[PDB]
Amino acid sequence: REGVFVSNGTHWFVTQRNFYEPQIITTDNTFVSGNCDVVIGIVNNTVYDPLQPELD
């Protein structure tokens, strides 16, 4: 949504552009658009959703 996908060698995070403050990639701070074969340079990773662990 805002910021950049930044990887530190092994893990991917989202971070605001002007100051390093990495966060876990979750469904809340990212948005979806279409299937994942048209964009160039896309990578693979888990996008955790906080609703699954609660399992209400």
Binding site: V4, R17, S33, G34, V38, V39, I40
Partner: protein
């Protein structure tokens, strides 16, 4: 000076004008073509303009 891949830079600018950045990643090829053609017509225009 902080280095950044050029398509991401242009995606930033798209947000700057209120267009969601996914719009750029889905038309990267087309956008690039339009830009190249425009730059090409610039020189001809300067030469043909009296």
């Amino acid at each position: 000076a902080l280095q950044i891949p050029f398509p991401m830079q242009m995606a930033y600018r798209f947000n700057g004008i209120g267009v969601t950045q996914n719009v750029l990643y889905e038309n990267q090829k087309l956008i690039a073509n339009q830009f190249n053609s425009a730059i090409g017509k610039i020189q001809d225009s300067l030469s043909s303009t009296p």
